[PDB]
């Protein structure tokens, strides 16, 4: 399993 | 940008017997960026239909991806993979050899 | 014996031919079990190992959101690493992230990691730690401060200690047969002569798995590294690898020279001289 999506928003770089 | 040539392997899966199918491999690696153009030549042709594995990358980001083909060898017909890459002026032609 | 997670990333724009390029790519070990690609007609996580079939929808469903969102955000972080490099909108650029957890002979977290490049250079690193980062210029500092201020690097420890550990053990209980499985390599020496006073051995390791080995020619009990042509370890594409090693050698010195086996899946290393 890859890693899940957080709670709020996934952090881009 | 830097930029990596792809290193060329051309083989069998199964050691070759002549009149016996198997399938032909040209493994790309080592190469950056991704884009890459990869041929599997019979007799100076190319091959339809041939097939290639998932872009994936090595520890040191370079990729790699196999292109193979199902065929059955001969004594007489020639197979080579031909390969461009940006950082090639040329396309690449390398022989497969059933020794290497 | 040791085992490990990884997933690969690759985000590639293409500017004025669409939207980046999101393809993610899983292994356990040296076996890929899913890819994901944003270009696929349908893109959708699709299995590439038999024993991953078995997984629900509910896990099928699970990834694609995952990969679908990730490739949105791998489509801001480009734009962003644009910037971060004073980048003109016009060249085609590569984010790769790799990450993925290692288990010792115990099933035991040895370590995680997840790293992260640009156009192929090092860009960000999570340390060992699975805390703190390590950016490899003022560019990757952005992204640094940007994550420590999101509280990333717990999110991605979570992940590596936690939901990484345990579906890695899942899927090497599943996948047992395999992936738990070691093939030896099946070897042999070549002579070829290559004039009147030289000739060429090839020791030929074949259908081993993992890709792991070493294969080295010693000329009287030394190695012979400098001497010796090694190819780069390359897949069968039947889940099993290859490589030779080749030296040149004086023609009559051929008993002089050993080729030595180490792999995983032998129950000892291997010695070998060319037998004519």
Redesign the interface.
């Known amino acids: 399993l890859p890693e899940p999506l957080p709670a709020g928003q996934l952090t881009a770089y | 940008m830097i930029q990596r040539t792809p290193k060329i392997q051309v083989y069998s899966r199964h050691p070759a017997e002549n009149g016996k199918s198997n399938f032909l491999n040209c493994y790309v690696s080592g190469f950056h960026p991704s884009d890459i153009e990869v041929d599997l030549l019979k007799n100076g042709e190319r091959i339809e239909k041939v097939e290639h594995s998932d872009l994936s990358f090595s520890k040191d980001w370079s990729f790699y991806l196999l292109y193979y083909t199902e065929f059955t060898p001969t004594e007489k017909d020639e197979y080579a993979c031909r390969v461009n890459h940006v950082t090639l002026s040329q396309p690449k032609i390398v022989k497969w050899d059933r020794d290497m | 014996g040791s085992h490990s997670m990884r ?2 990333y ?1 985000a ?1 724009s293409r500017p004025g031919r669409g939207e980046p390029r999101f ?5 356990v070990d040296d076996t ?1 079990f899913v ?1 994901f ?1 944003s270009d696929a007609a349908s893109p959708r996580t699709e299995p ?1 190992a038999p024993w991953i079939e078995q997984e629900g929808p509910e ?1 099928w469903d ?2 694609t ?3 679908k ?2 490739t949105q ?2 489509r ?2 480009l734009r ?2 644009r910037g971060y490099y004073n980048q003109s909108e016009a ?2 650029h ?3 992230r ?2 993925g957890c290692d288990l010792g002979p115990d099933g035991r977290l040895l370590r995680g990691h997840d790293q ?2 640009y ?6 690193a999570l340390n060992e730690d699975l805390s703190s980062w390590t950016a490899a210029d003022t560019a990757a500092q952005i ?1 640094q401060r ?2 420590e201020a ?1 509280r ?1 690097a717990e ?2 420890r979570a ?1 590596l200690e936690g ?2 550990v345990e ?1 890695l053990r899942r899927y090497l209980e599943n996948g047992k047969e395999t992936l738990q499985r070691a093939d030896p390599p099946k070897t042999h020496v ?1 002579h ?1 002569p290559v004039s009147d006073h030289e000739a060429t051995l ?1 020791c030929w390791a ?1 259908g081993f798995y993992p890709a792991e080995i070493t294969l080295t020619w010693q000329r009287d009990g030394e190695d012979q590294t400098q001497d010796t042509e090694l ?2 370890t ?5 889940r099993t690898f ?1 490589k ?1 090693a080749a030296v040149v050698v004086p023609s009559g010195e051929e008993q002089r020279y050993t080729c030595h086996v180490q792999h995983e899946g032998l129950p000892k290393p291997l010695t070998l001289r060319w037998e004519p």
């Open positions: 997933y690969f690759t590639m393809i993610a790519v899983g292994y890929q890819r690609d590439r896990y699970r990834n959101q995952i990969f969102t990730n955000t791998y801001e972080s962003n690493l060249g085609s590569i984010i790769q790799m990450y992260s490049a156009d192929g250079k090092d860009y960000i992204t940007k994550w999101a990333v999110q991605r992940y939901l990484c579906w070549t070829h090839r074949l190819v780069e390359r897949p069968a594409g039947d290859q030779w």
